[PDB]
Swiss-Prot record, chain A:
Component of the cylindrical core that assembles on the inner surface of the capsid during capsid formation and plays a role in viral DNA ejection into the host cell. The inner core is composed of stacked rings of gp14, gp15 and gp16 proteins. Following binding to the host cell surface, the internal core is diassembled and gp16 is ejected along with gp14 and gp15 into the infected cell. Gp16 probably inserts in the host inner membrane and remains associated with gp15. It comes from Escherichia phage T7. Homotetramer. Interacts with gp15; after ejection the gp15-gp16 complex composed of a gp15 octamer and a gp16 tetramer probably binds both the viral DNA and the host inner membrane. The N-terminus contains the transglycosylase activity (Potential). The C-terminus is essential for the viral DNA translocation into the host cytoplasm. This is Peptidoglycan transglycosylase gp16. Belongs to the transglycosylase Slt family. It is found in: Virion; Host cell inner membrane. The chain holds residues 178 to 224 of 1318 of the full protein.
UniProtKB/Swiss-Prot annotation, chain B:
This is Internal virion protein gp15. It is found in: Virion; Host periplasm. Component of the cylindrical core that assembles on the inner surface of the capsid during capsid formation and plays a role in viral DNA ejection into the host cell. The inner core is composed of stacked rings of gp14, gp15 and gp16 proteins. Following binding to the host cell surface, the internal core is disassembled and gp15 is ejected along with gp14 and gp16 into the infected cell. Gp15 probably remains associated with gp16. Homooctamer. Interacts with gp16; after ejection the gp15-gp16 complex composed of a gp15 octamer and a gp16 tetramer probably binds both the viral DNA and the host inner membrane. Interacts with gp14. Belongs to the T7virus internal virion protein gp15 family.
Length: 47, 79
């Protein structure tokens, strides 16, 4: 008699959904002003 | 020609005994595949009540995870 059970296995799949990635942590407004205008916020308002 | 008729039944009773011990190996293979899809970074449950079932495995009992759990640890210990 033939064995009515096959080594063939059932298959499940992962709920892999990719949406839209996020923007990285934008620079702080103080550091933004620094490496763009070479001088901090305090040194800019003293004028 | 009576012993032939006896073997037609004894072979049926041996194929029904390799049906309930290939099920209990299919279930450990599918549980391992689930753990491996969960480890390698994919979002599929690993509870015994959420495996797939395809008539080569049947419904999963709790003891078909205990058996698996004591068998990965047994295999990892032997490396």
């Amino acid at each position: 008699h033939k064995q009515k059970v096959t080594q063939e296995l059932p298959e499940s799949t992962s709920f892999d959904v990719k949406g839209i990635e996020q923007e990285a942590t934008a620079k702080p407004f103080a550091k933004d002003f620094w490496e763009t205008h070479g001088e901090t916020l305090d040194e800019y308002n003293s004028r | 020609e009576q012993v032939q008729n006896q073997m037609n039944a004894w072979t049926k009773a041996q194929a029904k005994a390799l049906d309930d011990s290939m099920k209990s190996m299919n279930k450990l293979d599918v549980i391992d595949k689930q753990f491996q899809k969960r480890i390698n970074g994919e979002w599929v449950s690993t509870d015994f009540k959420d495996m797939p079932v395809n008539e080569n495995t049947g419904e999963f009992k709790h003891s078909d995870m205990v058996n698996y759990a004591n068998k990965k640890l047994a295999e990892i210990d032997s490396m």
